[model samples]
Target: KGSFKKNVVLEVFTAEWCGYCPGGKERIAKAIEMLDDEYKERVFQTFVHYNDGISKKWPRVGQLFIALDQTLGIPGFPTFSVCRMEKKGENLSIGAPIAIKNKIMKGFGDGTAPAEVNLKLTKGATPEDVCTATFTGKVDADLIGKPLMLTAYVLKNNMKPINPQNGAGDGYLHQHTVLMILSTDVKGDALNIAADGSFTIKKEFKLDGFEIKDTDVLAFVHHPMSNAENHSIINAGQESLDKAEPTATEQIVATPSVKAYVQNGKIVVEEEYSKMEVFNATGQLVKNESLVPGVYVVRITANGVMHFLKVLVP
Candidate 1:
């Protein structure tokens, strides 16, 4: 109940232009304070500036939100979305307290991700410059060239972007702002869930290490064409892939997880899990006694570093 690391990432699509965002921001702050032990630790938020483009890259932010509203039939200040992308997703909660509580709880349960995505920084990257954050993962089913969007952002450690609201030019603070979009909002590539059960995708971006702590990767599968739930929507928080995408240009080093394990060549998976103690994917306990056969990922934690092994069930 302390922290759900690598769980679900909560992104609030907001704008200074929207009068109600201020209260929404406040609610978010309070929620973060209230549930740090239960969910905040695992919940990473991306505050998309629907109006205030402090990062100089969110001009279309408002449009995207509007489109999202159009897709989800949502109209309000703080509409919570579960999936990372807005194309086709679900709404976690609508208004104040409910939204706050749902957001903290985040995804399915135990913050589990049924779908998997592996990310990497490919070419034209260095220590003193930024580069593209490529995402390599697969869809679980055969999507008819199902369209989706891949979003990428920066997770600066303790960034205090001059508070335009409560801090009011006081140079206060901020966390997980959308910064920018990496791929097309509609169709990038059809991620075909292979017979082996895997797929891959990538996104390119210019680096901004000076203002950012490091690189972070957030690749949520979305259906910009339809915005469906099982297919991928805006509020499901389904494909929970949140990690800082770093580069070769930076002089900093990454701290690998201390967790280690022997996959035994298999991993268990739960699609659309939020890791919430109160509610989970199903009201059942998963252990050796309640396991099924299929392809799974085996995670190993050793010395705070994470090691994984892929396993399959015949």
Candidate 2:
């Protein structure tokens, strides 16, 4: 319902008993794979497991029952819709896995999830990691009694699986959306948090039972365990290596000789050396300097000499 850059949430109306429930869930999984990153991240799938049979207690599912149906128009059992808004050609047959995949793929190119919110990520760890990860950002702070929760997920690529709904000749096919959601609750509680809003939460992960690289960190806070602000996945890192770059590196020195931004003497860039080129021994040829405004190349030498050392122009 928002901009394209943000996540395009796919709200599906489904139940456990619906025969088509399996297919609908399968369709969602497929769509997740086919969609691009922008669309993929934006493509949120929230399964509303419910039932309408006489034996099934849909109505007794609490206030959520009336709300979901009234808002989403749950006329049937396994109904698939985008953000609860039903569109033409959105039935069981037409809105099959392939069709939904195509639509979300189109949404990727198209603009959706445009509402902008900055987020960050940290890796898994035990209580023993040397450096803990902290998420620092701005959001409405004054919302009182807001409860924040942290979740972790494991992701891998290029997996193969069988498609339940296949042609007569083709039984099951290799699947790209084959994923295992480890647990919505990777940890017991949020590592650290702030109550007043604009927070900088420093939480440590203990990689005791889980491997850091295989999992991702997701944190959310709710006023009363209801609709959250937005499940934002901003910062992510490889679990294998420890990075030298500070988690927050926004601005730095203006001097052309300085290759990367730093805090004190700690280099805060990912690469060991600058990507820009360097030309040593070609001193005082300031004419070519303006060839590319705001461009600089810091060269390294064998004898521990830097090209931009004294050659840096005033």
Candidate 3:
């Protein structure tokens, strides 16, 4: 059976005026630093600063932050939403850095996701202030008809605010600071999946009055419901402005060479694959031999490249 890797999205709610918020920030930084490279690379962070000087400068940021806070029912500032998950009736307000580390560790358990997400960012030419984001992915069969939402946030790193932070002293540098929301709605825009459980969405944004080198886009897909179980992020992705392609001139268009299909209730691979994994409609890894009559997602790894295929056993 094949395994799918899950990326964790960490949304931090903080304001420059809050004294304890800096402490929370430091804890999260330390927590992320303590993890192994494998898990650290999968963690994506976005800071939602509201009711402060930064937010006041950009009123839309404040409005979106407040809307998200109220929607999540967060009690106070300096709160952490790990994948928007609520554990044991708590909102992941853990204080210590190790606790934060443990919470993030828990998010990578088993490394399986209900869906797969691929994101890329490209910079514009003529205006130089415009950028485009493309999101594409395939979902499991169980999520076919569900109301799935896709959200993207523009984050600015190494931001030095004019106003002084209360607890962190005079000059404080903020990283992963949310600058703009790309989705039409603060919650997310409705994602339309095709009959094959595949979807693609492209959005363009203006990066006026901001340094492109220090900017990045964070995106994810999740259920827009209020319940913790339903709202947990399915997958997350991030792309930096500096790494974005210039006008998409260097697009690589190589098709996978591996071929996977089902025959006589068993998965068959035409190429010489090193490994093959089969996942059922419920996102559960199942043995490929003698699979029952149902839909399956087959993953084949050949020549160090991975290929995904959908098969139906009737």
Candidate 4:
């Protein structure tokens, strides 16, 4: 048997001035709440702010920003693409919770794609000054040469927009607003997977002008080409940075028994833990396994005791 992990991704493009967008955002939240645990964990969403001259490029987490009008013919504000498979003119008019839920379910049930995406976020060396996001990916042997790209996103939450939408009170909660795009390419860099079907990637971000406590990181994989799956997110992973602080080596482990090493570019751990985490040089958590060739730190735990190790990959 092979392996495949598929997750549904929702990319919403909204402008602060767009009145209808706020309600649409609420409906999305409702839909997520309606799903069961299995579907809930696999569901992910990112909010992109645009059109407003002020902070127009905020969250610079680009990709998935491409207008979704191709499906519904020039959509207005607050429009979204669910798994990049939205249809034309069907739910274009109703941005309701149920409408959104149906679309999400369709994307969730689509197929057993061949890749897996995992993400992690942690405070940077200077917790008050920087942060990091790491992304990891592994594809099935079938997709070896299929042009795969992994994209990372940094989104801010609890933002109070002056004019979010009509009827939105002064306390409106604006979450998942894009704050930065880590990848040089708006879409993603060409990810090269080994014959073993795995790779790792890492990216860092500064904490200036951002509420460090209200941030989250997300990563997804898609084929950036003329194929039917173009822009359609195949798999995705998300992690939070709430109250996340700089990692002190001592904070994880000192006298440790777990041994870890990088073999063929993937971190191989010698023990199992209730939780295992990886961090970059900047003290940020490692989000992706499809990493650049470099040195990395890994943390493993057993029965709640954590230990840290350094992993070097060629």
Q: Against the true structure, whose lDDT is highest?
A: 3
How many clashes in each structure? Answer: 60, 18, 1, 21
Which candidate gets the maximum TM-score versus the true structure?
3
The runs of at least 3 residues in candidate 3 whose Cα sits more than 4 Å from the true structure, single-residue gaps closed, are 1-3, 87-89, 125-128, 169-171, 226-229, 248-314
Off by over 4 Å in 4: 53-74, 87-94, 125-128, 162-164, 225-229, 243-245, 249-314
Candidate 2: tens digits of C-alpha lDDT, residues 1-314: 33214334343554434556656666678767876555556554443435433114222222334444543345764564453333322342327667888655553444633222233444312212322344453334333234443322222222122223222123432211102222233222342434533445554433332223323332232222233233222211112112222233212535553444323422233344423343322221233333332222343332344433222222
- Model 2 Cα displacement at 205 (Å)? 18
Cα lDDT tens digits, model 4, 1-314, are 12775788887777778788778788899988888778888887887666563245453432335533443343676777776665454444336688778888888774466788776666754333356666777988888888888777777788777455554766887888777667776667788888888878877667545556677787887776335434566787888876554544423446657777766557877676787787765557877477677557777778677766766566
Residue-wise C-alpha lDDT for candidate 1, range 173-292, written one tens digit per residue: 555555555554523245555565555655555544334343344555545534454433322122212234333453354553322222443232332222312111122223433235
Error of 2 at 104 (Å): 2.5
What are the models' TM-scores?
A: 0.55, 0.35, 0.74, 0.69
- Residue-pair clash count for candidate 4: 21
| Candidates ranked, most accurate by lDDT first | 3, 4, 1, 2
RMSD to the native, candidate 1? 18.2
